[PDB]
Amino acid sequence: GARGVGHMTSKLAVTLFPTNEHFFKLEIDSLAILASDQNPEMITEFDSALVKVEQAVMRMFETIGGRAAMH
Amino acid sequence: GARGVGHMTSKLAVTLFPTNEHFFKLEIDSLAILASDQNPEMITEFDSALVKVEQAVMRMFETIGGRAAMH
Amino acid sequence: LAFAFMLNTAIQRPGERVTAEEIRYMAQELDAGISGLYSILSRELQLPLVRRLIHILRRKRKLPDFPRSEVTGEPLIKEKAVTGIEAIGRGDDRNKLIDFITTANQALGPQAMTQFLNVEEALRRLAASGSIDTTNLVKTK
Amino acid sequence: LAFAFMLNTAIQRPGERVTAEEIRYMAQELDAGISGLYSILSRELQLPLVRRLIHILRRKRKLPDFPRSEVTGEPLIKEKAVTGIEAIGRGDDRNKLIDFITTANQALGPQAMTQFLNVEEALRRLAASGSIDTTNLVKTK
């Protein structure tokens, strides 16, 4: 029982919150892009803003030590 | 008991405080960079200063012989 | 019990060699065995946590407010939760895109670079992708 | 008991050979089996120790004070903890970055060198990364 609990908890923690890849993705609503007749040229700047926000959120999350609490 | 205690202690000490990789990361808050509207050109110099501070902290730690006390 | 709790010990079969493809097969079995738990946890924990995190971040005034839809009012940017094989193989998705590009280049050759599949120009933007800024090397336009 | 104390004899199975992938699998199991302990130790010992060390270093006046947030007052730089597979595979993170760069280069070629992923220009700054100063060979701008 103890070994099973430890192994399952460890693998669940390492899978649900991978250390390398982002565990969440902020996606620009292409539906809104079509609805507002947005120019596809700005999507590069929008993607840059989105990735900056994504890394900022991940850094702030890791600051408060969420891994141990999640485990 | 003796073999297990020794083996676990050595493995935990080696893993928790790796000799080659840095065991901690002084990471600049790009959240504050966004908040202050910081110029992305200074990030290179900030990273350089941070890496110097990191290695300074590690050398100071190694000077006082923290490995044996940790073990 | 060992098979149920998804340990690695019951996987190994005494007597004879096991191929890498076989091991991948039973690893697929193990990842499949707790799919319901990964799904419910992804629905319950990952998403409200990130929403609360982003709300706190915005209230701190550390990042300006998200644009809202004119027609509906919903934020123009939403969220998604990645679990398990999806997280393992986001790199595989990247590899699939790059392999499609490479296969097209092999099929068409030097003459490829004309009118279907873009050669994707690597100096500027992917330096700004995954953070970091452009320029430095980049002889600006 | 040997399985519980994560010794090395338990993995060895008399009777036949064991593949390298099998050994990696059992090593993953062994690293997993103590996850709670590495987590609690990282949250308890590492962070306060490094904070006390940086405070004593600052008080000794060997380094000027950290800049503080104008909005919140929090220090502009925080501290992390790296344990286990993360420490083993920070090199794997670097390998993944370089492999992404190389796969992009293979897919696009020398015509890649223009406008997405930086050629990353190795003489000056990564020389200053991991200590060491710039210049020397560098024909300065």
Side-chain angles (χ1 to χ4, degrees), chain D residues 42-91:
Chain D
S42 92
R43 190 250 282 161
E44 182 27 87
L45 187 100
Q46 273 170 321
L47 153 71
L49 167 158
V50 65
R51 221 139 50 176
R52 167 67 167 175
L53 199 166
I54 192 160
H55 172 84
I56 179 67
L57 171 141
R58 170 195 273 105
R59 183 47 59 79
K60 264 195 166 189
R61 261 75 203 286
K62 299 160 148 284
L63 156 81
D65 308 316
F66 265 87
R68 54 149 288 189
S69 167
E70 308 167 354
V71 177
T72 79
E74 298 191 357
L76 298 191
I77 290 126
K78 324 283 281 163
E79 320 74 12
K80 327 304 309 182
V82 184
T83 55
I85 292 305
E86 317 182 358
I88 297 164
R90 259 172 299 186

Side-chain angles (χ1 to χ4, degrees), chain D residues 1-128:
Chain D
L1 227 49
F3 229 86
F5 270 67
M6 88 101 80
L7 296 91
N8 256 291
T9 313
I11 299 161
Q12 271 102 17
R13 318 295 293 271
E16 213 194 30
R17 276 172 138 190
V18 153
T19 75
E21 202 163 349
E22 276 178 312
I23 278 159
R24 261 181 51 195
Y25 208 41
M26 318 224 174
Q28 264 199 336
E29 179 177 0
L30 283 203
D31 171 276
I34 280 311
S35 178
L37 203 49
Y38 326 91
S39 97
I40 182 181
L41 263 282
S42 92
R43 190 250 282 161
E44 182 27 87
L45 187 100
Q46 273 170 321
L47 153 71
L49 167 158
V50 65
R51 221 139 50 176
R52 167 67 167 175
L53 199 166
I54 192 160
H55 172 84
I56 179 67
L57 171 141
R58 170 195 273 105
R59 183 47 59 79
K60 264 195 166 189
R61 261 75 203 286
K62 299 160 148 284
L63 156 81
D65 308 316
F66 265 87
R68 54 149 288 189
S69 167
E70 308 167 354
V71 177
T72 79
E74 298 191 357
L76 298 191
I77 290 126
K78 324 283 281 163
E79 320 74 12
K80 327 304 309 182
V82 184
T83 55
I85 292 305
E86 317 182 358
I88 297 164
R90 259 172 299 186
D92 218 36
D93 260 358
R94 157 202 143 217
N95 292 336
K96 284 152 193 152
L97 166 63
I98 300 312
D99 199 51
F100 174 84
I101 295 153
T102 310
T103 326
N105 188 50
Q106 281 179 2
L108 324 173
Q111 274 214 353
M113 171 284 268
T114 323
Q115 313 165 34
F116 280 3
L117 181 89
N118 207 344
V119 187
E120 181 145 342
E121 54 164 38
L123 180 76
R124 271 202 143 188
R125 157 216 162 258
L126 263 171

Side-chain angles (χ1 to χ4, degrees), chain C residues 61-98:
Chain C
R61 285 222 200 252
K62 174 94 70 163
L63 155 73
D65 312 317
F66 261 126
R68 98 182 330 178
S69 167
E70 307 171 354
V71 180
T72 73
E74 297 192 359
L76 302 189
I77 288 126
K78 310 307 291 297
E79 49 281 354
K80 185 282 181 163
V82 184
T83 55
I85 290 301
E86 314 177 354
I88 300 165
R90 254 173 296 184
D92 212 45
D93 262 0
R94 150 204 150 213
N95 295 335
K96 283 157 193 155
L97 167 62
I98 296 314

Side-chain angles (χ1 to χ4, degrees), chain B residues 37-49:
Chain B
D37 210 308
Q38 295 215 353
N39 262 338
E41 302 193 329
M42 311 304 78
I43 321 315
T44 321
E45 288 61 35
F46 281 10
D47 270 344
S48 74

